[PDB]
């Protein structure tokens, strides 16, 4: 949760490990017309796997 900058609901909050996050690539990869939205990816999903 520190390394991914996620917050476990009882766990601690930290600074970003990689604060240079705001850069991005303009690409067709993760667009909304690509992604099937079924289950919201929770922060507990990101930390378990």
């Amino acid at each position: 949760g520190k390394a991914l900058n996620n917050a476990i609901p009882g766990g601690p909050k930290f600074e970003p490990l990689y604060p240079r996050e705001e850069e991005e690539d303009y690409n067709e990869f993760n667009s909304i017309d690509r992604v099937i939205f079924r289950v919201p990816i929770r922060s507990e999903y990101k930390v378990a796997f």
Binding site: N6, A7, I8, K13, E15, P16, E21, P40, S43
Partner: peptide, 27 residues
């Protein structure tokens, strides 16, 4: 939980970082 919403930190923000869900946005 930090589900993509909120802040990277509340250090340089001059806020508390307290996020609460909008009860107005439901349907």
């Amino acid at each position: 939980s930090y589900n993509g919403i909120g802040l990277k930190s509340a250090k340089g923000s001059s806020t508390s970082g307290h996020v609460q869900r909008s009860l107005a946005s439901n349907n």
